[PDB]
Design a protein around this nucleic acid. Structure first.
Ligand SMILES: [Mg+2]
Ligand SMILES: [Mg+2]
Lengths: 390, 406, 51, 107, 107, 254, 219, 219, 94
RNA sequence: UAAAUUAUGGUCAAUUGUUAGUAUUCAUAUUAAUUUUUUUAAAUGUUUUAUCAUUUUAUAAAGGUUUAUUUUUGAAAGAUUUUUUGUAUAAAAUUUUAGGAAUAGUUAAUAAUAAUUUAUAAUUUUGAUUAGAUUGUUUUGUUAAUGCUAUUAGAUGGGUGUGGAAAAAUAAAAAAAAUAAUUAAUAUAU
């Protein structure tokens, strides 16, 4: 539990504390074992996990992050229970073994449903068909795999969940020897996550798990990493990243728009990042949680023309081929379509070369939340706009 | 009746009060003192169904009834639910924890905008669990989990728990003991009316007064402190004593016909599992003497010697003179490991009580057997030798004025 | 009724109430004179007795 | 130190007392005279008890005679009431002439 | 527990004893048992600044606060009543010496 | 206000030290009723276990200013009838006051004289009892009375007990509660020990003898012929007016 | 059938006293008022009784009743009625005693309206922090004085202007110029010189003599 | 007060509080001071016989009752009777002494915790390895630990006159038992209460009989 | 009222007049009262010798009488071994 | 100021008496009479004891007049435990006068039981004190009625400091320490 002197960890101390050497670590087996240990808990195991000697705002943000981890793990618990119930129902209605259900086919489903309908059991045939239909979308062993890995990385990030996975009294299944196990599969799994997934903090912040600082610094590190693999000759001074090829490849970290947006002020246009790629200019803006501030956060057409004219003045690029385009990002997370549009527009990367440069992009399945409709309307009116030519 | 100890807890929840941890502790201890172990487990299930996370004192009070009932499954369930994250004290950590939870208060804003269920404070026992685990009673947990695995018959889990407890009591500092709580009673500050009958108020007998004990004690006391006030080596001695006491308890449970006063022929002779039991006890005593070096000269081993004599009297059928010889050899071994000329201690009243009960177990008999009026004795029983060994021992106890008879 | 009486409000019309008294007097208090529905159970004992 | 404790039931002043904070309005001369003259009469009465025993003994003796021989010295519900002319107001006209009115405070 | 309250005389009597117990300690500071003692001093000082204070009691309070090294929680009302005590007619150079030595040992 | 600090429950009461009906006077036989069973148990203790400061070689020499403060509550035994100075000797010759030493003089050492010593300031009594040896109780060699010549021998046998009390106090004052340690007597067990030659002369009885004849019957119960007070099982009278329990009635006329 | 509360109250009265109520309590009796005193010579100074006055605390007309639905029941969850209260500090002339004016609601069902009445309480503050003008939250407690059974639990809003006026050496609240009079007679302020006070005294005593002449009546 | 302006005030109670948590910067967690005792308990006045300076429920123990103790055991030279004669043996008295205590306080703790009439019979002196100890020095000045062997050398010609005015269980909160007769480290934490008597509810509040209509639960 | 009568009779230990005792003996709650006399059968005559002979002819065991008193007075729901084997946890926690 | 869009390719209704409950008679209903009925005349036996005594036996009426109410730790219940110890003395709240003004054994503090002191004290025009009337009480009556109109549970600072508690100068039961009687009805006159 929480002790006097426990502290929340950043990525550096998670990397340093869980730095062990492992060879051929099973991701799915240790993932299922750690989640089986998690699902066997009660709600009282989640109570005393906040470290006491902290200010109240930091304790509130830690409580919000732990509540988010708890509700996402409970959602995956009920999803896994539904998965096991559907697999057991299919193996009981059909008569096939349980381990070969996941490798079955749709022709096999048609044959088994026709066999059940021939015997006169239309209810069991409808149950088998509906269980297989809701099993084709959820039945993979790696379904929410990046989200579950980010949940376990967040449980390591809290710092108070590391001793909750060991010192259990178990029985041997074949000899019935009551013993106490000191093996910690959570530490081995977090060590393998830190060793293999070098950008697990970027996926952790992009999925909306970080409640303290958000995903903006992870976005800057992601864009700097994607600039270092495309320009390949990169100098980085403070908040300015530049390629030295003569062709303009510039990333400028202007300001943080969460503190820059004064509530009750009349100032049109506050951006976060400015990316100059060749002749193109992108104003990368992270939207705010205030819907009365999103209309003030995007710059005017005259302001974008002034920024493009300043680019023509400073970089010496002629104003015949100069294009400037706004880019709006979701406030608390970063969905898959936003990252795809960021790779398409800013860095001029298609899907195949982005999957070659970034391996974890294919299994990233974050989408826009349905309850935020005004942001989706603003992003539809913003991202479908033509490049403003000076 | 003892069932009322279960009743007044239940009426505590029917009348919409939150039972604190002291109520569960008092209910489990009152039902354990009356021999109602299932009612104590019902109190534990009541605490679990109220979704109250127990403190270490409630955990120890549950593990006492898990130890006395000999049920390892209950203790393993309680371990895997609550005690998997209990750590021993470290030299770097502070010995008392500071109070983390500020008492509940509302500002001038939170009185208005918060709803009435957020501004409501009942004495919820889950709020002060981090402040009731302030004094690090983990050594009382790892001892209790060492005992119940001895009761269920698990040697490897007992060896793991006892090895962890031994390494913690040899290489980690002693925690600060929790002070007693005087706010749990509503006793008056003084006697409101001063009036005291004399000891000789009755001309027919000597009666006890409220001022002084004039009739003498009926039962000998051990005259030792509580287990929380002990040091780490003293708690290791107490741990060996408790493991031997649970060995004695499980031997009396497995063989109830051969452990009481006679009532049958089988009391006189050893059981067939007594040699391995005494071998395990001797190996535990030699492990205690090998772990602690000269420091065992500066520790109180009165209850340890009394439990050693009770084990080598009940489990091993030994004579009272053999028990006196073993106690004298134990005290001379303790006085000899100090590497000085020293001066040996005397046997206490609890140590002499085991020798006298061994003398009574030598001369014990089966009264009114099948021959209608013939008491059956032990084979090879000599009344003259046993009486001669009793009389000089009684004179030895009476020569020492520091042993209080009972 | 005050002391020893379970009546909480007038039967038909009342002075204007605010807050939880407004929600209680109009929606949430007991009413055994309702011929259609009995006074409701707490959650979740109302879902399984819907019919 | 402006909010009382809901858990322990302490007052507004006792929470600030346990925090080492001082909330006291600037007093006038009479409000400081009320708090400064409490010790002066105690030192005067102790000096009278030490310096004139033959008068203090007679004063304490006649005070004990007036206390002991009184009619309403038995602790009862009437003697234990905080406001006797307000609780027992039907005696003030026809039976008790000590109190001429039944209202002395906001109750 | 609120059963009693300390005036300035009790503080001026308790502060040299606690300074002596600080000097007799192995460490320079006192043990943590007396944190409720100094707090009982800390509420007694800031209330007494709202009452009347003679010059000798203020000098004994300043010397006691300088003897055992404790900064009171108020620290401004004490300096405000020390400002009012400089230009008094009863002020002596011994009084100014004690006041300046105590303020240099505190500040 | 001052009236609303506490309630009037449990007020301050007058102590028993200032009430004449609660204070035992030493000129009465009731003084020797309370203090004589304390002496007969202390001599049982001193004859069976070593009491540290119960026997001295002289009277304890406190100064005259510390005489009233330290001496009441103190007891010691000396050899011979030597009385302390600055006292007025008053010999107890009342048979009503001397009757309470009957168990002390019969079952233990014979009481020769009981004296009450009253000083010049009349504030520190001394109850002096002179015994004549030897003891009727067996005395242990490790006991305190083995170091006394008047107790060990069977003028030279006289030894005196000295108990200092305050004159007009309740009987709580003249109590000796620190001497009620019950030390055993090993006189029946000294026969079978290794230190005696009688250890081989006794014969053990391991079985009960076969009884051919039953017990002798009681004589024929004759009921009383006088008027009885009533049923003692409902008048709350103990089984003879002496001891027992009312619920277990026995020893009366029926 | 669903019985009302009067059936339960009748059941309680039957189980207590053996019977509910003896009949014939109305009797339609003609209560006649017989006057004794003169026309305008009733022996009272304020209220002159000349009709049959009804007697009853809660059974009189027009009917009142306490209205438990107010700000206090909306804010505080109370163990009993009147335990927690919120009011304003109006008087600090007593040591360790703040006078707190609080409001409650009384319901008239005939006119169907609630009215706000005011009750003054004496509360306790040990450190003397309550200034006249503070919105305070007081709570019930033991008997402290003859009229003190409340204490200041929290100061929900301090009077900043009162504290700044107390820092200036002034009163916290400037005192009112109006208040209670001393008599029904018009209290005229006398402004005269030091020499013209005897004739003013003669006029005042002559006016008192004419007020005593009013006892004579006609002529 | 006017209750209809409550909810808008709640908006202000929101709009200030969210303004507060964003305005100030929290430096760090302030340590928790122990709460005192209130003199404002509900109900009637209690007696001075039961005033234990605690009028609420606190399930935890704070810092003024926490003591740092050392289990110091001190040896005494005794003599036991054997069949030959006297033999010199050792009797150990164990106390819990505080770490910052002096040796005279350790001697007083040995005097008050022996509970034997044969041990503290005369004035003794504490020593280590024959070298006598200064009674005005701390235990830390001599390096006295649990394993340090401390002897008590007596002078049997004197007589120890003690006056036990301090109770055996004296803590800071001043709660002492009169019939305690035991060191507080020896007695158990929880035991069966034989002095009290179990009492059940004999006064029904609203329900008294035949039919439970409402039960008069508001009362 | 059966439950209130048993509460005031056992827990609170009320008194009983003879007419409510006879009325409750008609209900099977109590035995017939002391005053309900069969006037054809006289009162018994006791002698201790015949009582001792009947007591020594057939007296119960000590442990059987103790367990009967424990079932009648202390509690009557004592769990069997087959129920203790069901109340204990299983292999995921055991 | 959008300008009459064209398979009109689906008409055949309603009523089978089954109801989400304050409903209004300016002349009818409540009061006394055309009719009431039936009795009652005081002057009195509670009991056990250890005997000129002691143990148990705590709310009769008129008068005077009240904004409000309840619970003894003590006696009993009551137990093979025991301290005259088992939290009773408190709060909110709501009265009336056809000719409306002042009130006080007084308010708070207090090292103050049992107040030689301090204070710019306390109640009241948001209706006080006194005087009058006066037990209160969704229990009564009436009506379509959140209206009007009635009431009879009670308590009792100088009779005795006894008793746990004054409630004590008189009550058809509340059966009051051995089963007095316990089938029934009158249960009282007698
Ligand atoms: Mg009783
Ligand atoms: Mg004063």
């Amino acid at each position: 539990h929480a002790t006097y002197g426990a502290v929340p960890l950043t990525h550096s101390q998670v990397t340093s504390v869980y730095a062990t050497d492992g060879g051929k670590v099973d991701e799915l087996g240790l993932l299922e074992l750690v989640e089986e240990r998690i699902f066997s808990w009660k709600l009282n195991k989640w109570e005393m996990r906040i470290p006491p000697n902290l200010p109240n705002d930091q304790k509130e943000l830690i409580r919000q992050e732990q509540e988010n981890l708890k509700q996402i793990l409970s959602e995956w618990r009920k999803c896994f229970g539904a998965l096991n119930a559907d697999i057991l129902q299919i193996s009981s209605l059909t008569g096939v073994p349980k381990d070969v259900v996941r490798e079955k086919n749709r022709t096999w489903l048609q044959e088994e449903v026709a066999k059940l309908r021939w015997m006169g059991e239309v209810n069991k045939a409808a149950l088998l068909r509906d269980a297989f239909m809701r099993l084709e979308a959820f039945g993979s062993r790696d379904f929410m795999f990046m989200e579950r890995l980010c949940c376990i990385y967040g449980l390591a990030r809290q710092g108070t969940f590391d001793e909750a996975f060991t010192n259990y009294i178990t029985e041997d299944p074949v000899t019935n020897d009551i013993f106490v196990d000191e093996r910690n599969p959570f530490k081995e799994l977090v060590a393998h996550i830190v060793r293999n997934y070098s950008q697990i903090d970027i996926i952790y912040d992009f999925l909306g798990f970080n409640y303290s600082e958000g995903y903006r610094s992870s976005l800057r590190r992601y864009m700097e990493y994607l600039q270092c693999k495309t320009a390949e000759n990169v100098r980085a001074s403070g908040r300015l990243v530049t390629g030295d090829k003569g062709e303009h490849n510039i990333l400028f970290d202007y300001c943080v728009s969460r503190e820059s947006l004064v509530s009750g002020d009349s100032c049109q246009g506050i951006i976060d990042f400015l990316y100059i790629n060749g002749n193109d200019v992108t104003l990368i803006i992270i939207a705010s949680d205030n819907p009365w501030l999103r209309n003030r956060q995007l710059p005017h057409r005259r302001q974008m023309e002034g920024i493009a004219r300043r680019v023509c003045f400073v970089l010496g690029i002629p104003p015949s081929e100069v294009r400037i385009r706004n880019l709006l990002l979701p406030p608390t997370y970063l969905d898959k379509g936003s990252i795809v549009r960021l790779n398409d527009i800013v860095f001029r990367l298609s899907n195949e070369q982005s999957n070659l440069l970034i391996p974890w992009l294919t299994n990233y399945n974050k989408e826009l939340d349905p309850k935020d409709v005004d942001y989706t309307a603003l992003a539809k009116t913003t991202n479908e706009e033509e490049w403003l030519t000076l | 009746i003892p069932q009322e100890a279960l009743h007044w807890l239940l009426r505590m929840i029917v009348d919409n009060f939150n039972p604190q941890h002291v109520h569960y502790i008092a209910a489990m201890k009152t039902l354990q003192s009356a021999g109602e172990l299932d009612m104590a487990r019902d109190v534990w299930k009541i605490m679990e169904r109220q979704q109250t996370w127990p403190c270490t004192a409630t955990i120890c009070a549950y593990l006492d009834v898990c130890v006395e009932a000999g049920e390892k499954t209950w203790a393993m369930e309680a371990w895997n639910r609550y005690c998997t994250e209990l750590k021993f004290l470290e030299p770097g950590e502070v010995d008392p924890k500071p109070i983390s939870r500020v008492p509940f208060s509302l500002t001038r804003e939170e009185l208005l905008y918060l709803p009435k269920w957020k501004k409501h404070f009942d004495h919820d026992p889950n709020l002060d669990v981090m402040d009731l685990n302030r004094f690090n009673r983990t050594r009382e947990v790892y001892l209790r989990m060492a005992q119940v695995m001895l009761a269920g018959g698990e040697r490897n889990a007992f060896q793991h728990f006892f090895t962890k407890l031994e390494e913690a009591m040899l290489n980690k500092p002693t925690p600060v003991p929790e002070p007693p709580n005087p706010h749990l009673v509503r006793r008056p500050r003084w006697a409101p009316y001063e009036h005291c009958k004399s000891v000789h108020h009755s001309p027919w007998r000597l009666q006890n007064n409220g001022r002084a004990l004039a009739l003498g004690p009926p039962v000998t006391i051990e005259d030792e402190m509580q287990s929380r006030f002990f040091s780490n080596d003293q708690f290791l001695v107490h741990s060996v004593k408790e493991v031997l006491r649970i060995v004695l308890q499980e031997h009396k449970r497995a063989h109830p016909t051969e452990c009481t006063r006679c009532k049958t022929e089988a009391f006189f002779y050893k059981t067939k599992d007594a040699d391995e039991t005494l071998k395990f006890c001797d190996d535990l005593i030699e492990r205690l003497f090998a772990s602690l070096g000269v420091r065992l000269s500066n520790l109180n081993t009165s209850s340890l010697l009394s439990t050693i004599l009770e084990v080598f009297r009940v489990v091993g059928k030994e004579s009272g003179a053999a028990l006196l010889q073993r106690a004298n050899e134990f005290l001379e071994r303790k006085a000899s490991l100090g590497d000085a000329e020293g001066s040996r201690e005397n046997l206490t009243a609890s140590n002499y009580l085991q020798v006298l009960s061994g003398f009574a177990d030598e001369s014990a008999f089966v009264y009114n057997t099948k021959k209608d009026g013939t008491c059956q004795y032990k084979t090879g029983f000599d009344p003259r030798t046993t009486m001669r060994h009793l009389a000089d021992v009684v004179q030895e106890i009476a020569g020492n004025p520091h042993v209080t008879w009972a | 009724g005050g002391p020893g009486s379970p009546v909480r409000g007038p039967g038909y019309y009342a002075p204007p109430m605010e807050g939880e008294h407004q929600r209680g007097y109009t929606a949430e208090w007991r009413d055994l004179r309702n011929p259609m529905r009995p006074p409701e159970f707490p959650t979740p004992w109302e879902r399984k007795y819907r019919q | 130190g402006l909010n009382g404790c809901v858990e322990t039931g302490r007052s507004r002043s006792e929470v600030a007392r346990d925090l080492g904070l001082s909330y006291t309005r600037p007093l006038h001369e009479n409000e400081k005279k009320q708090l400064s003259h409490q010790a002066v009469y105690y030192e005067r009465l102790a000096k009278f008890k030490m310096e004139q025993p033959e008068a203090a003994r007679a004063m304490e003796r006649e005070r004990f005679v007036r206390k002991f021989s009184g009619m309403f010295v038995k602790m009862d519900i009437r003697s234990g009431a905080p406001d006797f002319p307000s609780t027992y107001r039907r005696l003030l006209g026809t039976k008790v002439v000590r109190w001429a009115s039944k209202r002395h405070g906001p109750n | 527990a609120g059963k009693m309250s300390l005036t300035l005389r009790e503080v001026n009597t308790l502060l040299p004893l606690l300074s002596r117990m600080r000097r007799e300690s192995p460490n320079g500071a006192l043990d943590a048992r007396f944190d409720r003692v100094f707090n009982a001093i800390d509420t007694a000082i800031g209330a007494a600044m709202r009452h009347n204070c003679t010059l000798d009691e203020l000098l004994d309070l300043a010397e006691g606060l300088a003897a055992c090294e404790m900064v009171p929680s108020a620290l401004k009302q004490v300096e405000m009543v020390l400002i009012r005590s400089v230009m008094m007619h009863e002020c002596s150079p011994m009084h100014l010496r004690r006041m300046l030595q105590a303020m240099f040992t505190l500040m | 206000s001052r009236r609303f600090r506490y309630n009037t429950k449990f007020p301050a009461l007058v102590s028993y030290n200032k009430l004449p009906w609660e204070v035992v006077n030493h000129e009465t036989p009731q003084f020797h009723m309370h203090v004589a069973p304390h002496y007969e148990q202390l001599l049982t203790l001193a004859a069976s276990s070593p009491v540290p400061h119960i026997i001295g070689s002289k009277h304890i020499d406190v100064p005259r200013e510390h005489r009233l403060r330290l001496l009441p509550g103190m007891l010691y035994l000396l050899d011979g009838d030597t009385l302390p100075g600055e006292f007025t000797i008053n010999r107890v010759l009342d048979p009503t006051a001397l009757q309470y030493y009957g168990r002390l003089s019969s079952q233990i050492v014979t009481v020769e004289a009981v004296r009450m010593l009253v000083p010049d300031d009349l504030r520190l009594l001394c109850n002096c009892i002179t015994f004549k040896g030897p003891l009727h109780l067996p005395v242990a060699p490790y006991a305190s009375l083995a170091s006394l010549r008047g107790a060990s021998q069977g003028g030279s046998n006289c030894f005196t007990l000295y108990h200092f009390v305050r004159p007009n106090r309740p009987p709580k004052e003249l109590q000796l509660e620190k001497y009620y340690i019950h030390a055993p007597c090993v006189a029946p067990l000294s026969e079978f020990a290794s230190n005696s030659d009688e250890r081989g002369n006794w014969r053990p009885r391991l079985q009960a003898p076969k009884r051919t004849r039953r017990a002798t019957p009681l004589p024929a119960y004759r009921p009383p012929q006088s008027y009885l007070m009533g049923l003692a099982e409902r008048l709350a009278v103990v089984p003879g007016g002496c001891f027992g329990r009312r619920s277990l009635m026995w020893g009366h006329w029926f | 059938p669903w019985w009302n509360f009067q059936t339960e109250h009748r059941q309680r009265c039957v189980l207590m006293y053996g019977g509910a109520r003896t009949k014939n309590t109305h009797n339609a009796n003609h209560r006649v008022f017989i006057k004794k005193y003169k026309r305008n010579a009733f022996p009272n100074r304020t209220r002159h009784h000349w009709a049959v006055s009804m007697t009853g605390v809660l059974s009189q007309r027009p009917r009142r009743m306490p209205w438990p639905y107010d700000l206090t029941s909306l804010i505080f969850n109370q163990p009993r009625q009147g335990s927690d209260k919120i009011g304003y500090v109006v008087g600090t002339s007593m040591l360790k005693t703040a006078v707190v004016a609080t409001n409650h609601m009384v319901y008239y069902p005939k006119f169907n309206q609630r009215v706000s009445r005011t009750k003054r309480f004496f509360a306790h503050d040990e450190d003397l922090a309550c200034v006249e003008g503070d919105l305070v939250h007081i709570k019930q407690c033991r008997k402290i004085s003859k009229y003190k059974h409340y204490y200041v639990f929290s100061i929900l809003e301090p009077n900043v202007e009162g504290r700044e006026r107390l820092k200036l050496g002034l009163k916290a609240v400037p005192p009112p110029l109006f208040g209670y009079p001393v008599s029904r007679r018009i209290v005229k302020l006398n402004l005269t010189s030091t020499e013209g006070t005897q004739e003013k005294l003669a006029a005042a005593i002559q006016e008192h003599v004419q007020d005593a002449y009013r006892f004579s009546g006609p002529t | 007060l006017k209750a209809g302006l409550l909810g808008h005030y709640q908006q202000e109670a929101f709009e200030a509080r969210k303004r507060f948590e964003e305005s100030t910067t929290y430096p760090g967690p302030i340590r928790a001071a122990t709460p005192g005792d209130t003199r404002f308990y509900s109900g009637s006045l209690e007696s001075i016989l039961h005033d234990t300076d605690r009028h609420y429920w606190r399930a935890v123990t704070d810092d003024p009752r926490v003591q740092h103790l050392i289990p110091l055991r001190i040896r005494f030279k005794i003599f036991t009777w054997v069949t030959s004669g006297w033999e010199q043996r050792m009797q150990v008295v164990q106390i819990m002494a505080p770490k910052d205590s002096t040796i005279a306080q350790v001697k007083d703790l040995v005097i008050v915790e022996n509970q034997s009439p044969y041990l503290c019979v005369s004035s003794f002196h504490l020593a280590i390895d024959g070298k006598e100890l200064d009674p005005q020095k701390t235990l830390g000045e001599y390096g006295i630990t649990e394993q340090s062997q401390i002897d008590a050398i007596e002078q049997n010609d004197h007589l120890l006159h003690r006056d036990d005015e301090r109770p055996r269980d004296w803590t800071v909160d001043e709660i002492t038992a009169e019939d305690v007769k035991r060191s507080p480290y020896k007695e158990m934490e929880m035991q069966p209460l034989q002095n009290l008597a179990p009492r059940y509810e004999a006064r029904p509040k609203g329900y008294f009989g035949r039919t439970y209509y409402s039960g008069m639960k508001q009362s | 009222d059966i439950d209130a009568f048993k509460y005031w009779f056992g827990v609170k230990r009320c008194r009983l007049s003879m007419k409510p005792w006879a009325l409750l003996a008609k209900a099977g709650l109590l035995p017939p009262s002391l005053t309900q006399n069969s006037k054809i059968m006289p009162k018994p005559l006791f002698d201790k010798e015949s009582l001792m002979r009947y007591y020594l002819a057939n007296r119960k065991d000590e442990d059987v009488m103790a367990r009967e008193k424990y079932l009648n007075y202390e509690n009557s729901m004592v769990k069997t071994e087959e129920e203790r084997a069901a109340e204990r946890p299983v292999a995921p926690y055991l």
